[PDB]
Structure formats: structure tokens, C-alpha cells
Design a protein around this motif. Sequence first.
Motif, PDB file in Angstrom:
ATOM      1  N   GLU A  83      -4.023  75.067 -16.495  1.00 41.52           N
ATOM      2  CA  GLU A  83      -4.975  73.985 -16.772  1.00 41.52           C
ATOM      3  C   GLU A  83      -6.546  74.673 -16.426  1.00 41.52           C
ATOM      4  O   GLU A  83      -7.458  73.974 -17.097  1.00 41.52           O
ATOM      5  CB  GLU A  83      -4.639  72.936 -15.804  1.00 41.52           C
ATOM      6  N   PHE A  84      -6.435  75.653 -15.915  1.00 41.68           N
ATOM      7  CA  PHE A  84      -7.927  76.032 -15.470  1.00 41.68           C
ATOM      8  C   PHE A  84      -8.542  76.927 -16.707  1.00 41.68           C
ATOM      9  O   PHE A  84      -7.755  78.200 -16.786  1.00 41.68           O
ATOM     10  CB  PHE A  84      -7.911  76.770 -14.168  1.00 41.68           C
ATOM     11  N   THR A 109     -11.248  73.331  -9.602  1.00 40.87           N
ATOM     12  CA  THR A 109     -11.818  72.814 -10.692  1.00 40.87           C
ATOM     13  C   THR A 109     -13.436  72.913 -10.702  1.00 40.87           C
ATOM     14  O   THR A 109     -13.750  73.245 -11.832  1.00 40.87           O
ATOM     15  CB  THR A 109     -11.550  71.307 -10.886  1.00 40.87           C
ATOM     16  N   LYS A 110     -14.073  72.626  -9.803  1.00 44.66           N
ATOM     17  CA  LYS A 110     -15.479  72.683  -9.732  1.00 44.66           C
ATOM     18  C   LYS A 110     -16.007  74.134  -9.825  1.00 44.66           C
ATOM     19  O   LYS A 110     -17.138  74.309 -10.551  1.00 44.66           O
ATOM     20  CB  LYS A 110     -15.906  72.151  -8.358  1.00 44.66           C
ATOM     21  N   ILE A 153      -7.122  72.232  -5.758  1.00 44.56           N
ATOM     22  CA  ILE A 153      -7.532  72.041  -7.200  1.00 44.56           C
ATOM     23  C   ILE A 153      -8.907  71.450  -7.358  1.00 44.56           C
ATOM     24  O   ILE A 153      -9.398  71.836  -8.423  1.00 44.56           O
ATOM     25  CB  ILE A 153      -6.420  70.625  -7.451  1.00 44.56           C
ATOM     26  N   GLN A 154      -9.381  70.654  -6.341  1.00 48.35           N
ATOM     27  CA  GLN A 154     -10.553  69.802  -6.518  1.00 48.35           C
ATOM     28  C   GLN A 154     -11.716  71.403  -6.624  1.00 48.35           C
ATOM     29  O   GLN A 154     -12.533  71.495  -7.348  1.00 48.35           O
ATOM     30  CB  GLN A 154     -11.070  69.219  -5.513  1.00 48.35           C
ATOM     31  N   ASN A 205     -15.440  76.871 -11.640  1.00 44.03           N
ATOM     32  CA  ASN A 205     -14.902  77.308 -12.900  1.00 44.03           C
ATOM     33  C   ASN A 205     -15.863  78.491 -13.331  1.00 44.03           C
ATOM     34  O   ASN A 205     -15.352  79.155 -14.281  1.00 44.03           O
ATOM     35  CB  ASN A 205     -15.332  76.363 -14.017  1.00 44.03           C
TER      36      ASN A 205
END
Length: 123
Positions: A87-88, A68-69, A64-65, A71
Motif C-alpha cells: 500500500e505504501f 503514510t506521512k 501506519i500513520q 512518504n
Amino acid sequence: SLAKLLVIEDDAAIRLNLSVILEFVGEQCEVIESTQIDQINWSAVWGGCILGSLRGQALSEQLIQSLTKANHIPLLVANKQPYSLEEFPNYVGELDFPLNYPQLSDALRHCKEFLGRKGFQVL
């Protein structure tokens, strides 16, 4: 796609399946298990990231981390999964099973188009 595809898949048979088919359609890929995410340079420009079945049926907090980074990497889901990538913002869709050339080509095309909006390539 100029850059390799990243594939994260915890089923050995599907790792093989995805590897063979992606190569067949002219793509290069790095195929790993979800326990190998530290082995990936997430800052680099990948052609996409295909996420499949994952140990625990969910995204680890570490993945997830990373997702997220990172992108700038367009995200695909291989087969229907108990987790969701909505969510992404870089999520671009799913790969249907059984895999077929028209649907896979569209998915990879959506990855290219995503990368294009981000400023990375033109075909």
C-alpha cells in the motif's frame, strides 16, 4: 547513503544482526523496537527504513500513520513478513535471508535511487 538508516525490528537477535551488517557495509543506523516509534523524527530525511519482525505480526495503526506521512523515506522489508507494504508508494523491496552482500547492496542502491527521484541526493 548519507543519512542513517532507520531499522524497526522487534527481535533482539535480528536487531543485532542488522546493526552489525549495516555498519559493515558502511551505513549508519538507528535501530529501534516497534514501541519506540515516537522516538523517531519522521520528518527528517533518512537513508531508508527497514522493517522486520513486529510484535503482533502486523503494522500498528501508529506505525501506519507514520509510514503514510513519511512518504519521502524508502521502505525495505527484512525477511518475509506476515504483513505487506504494498500500500505504501515508498516501498522499494525486500531484503532476502540469509543476507548477502550483492542482494543487500542492490536494496540499499534502490533506496539511494528512490531518494534521488525525490530530489535528495546524487552519487
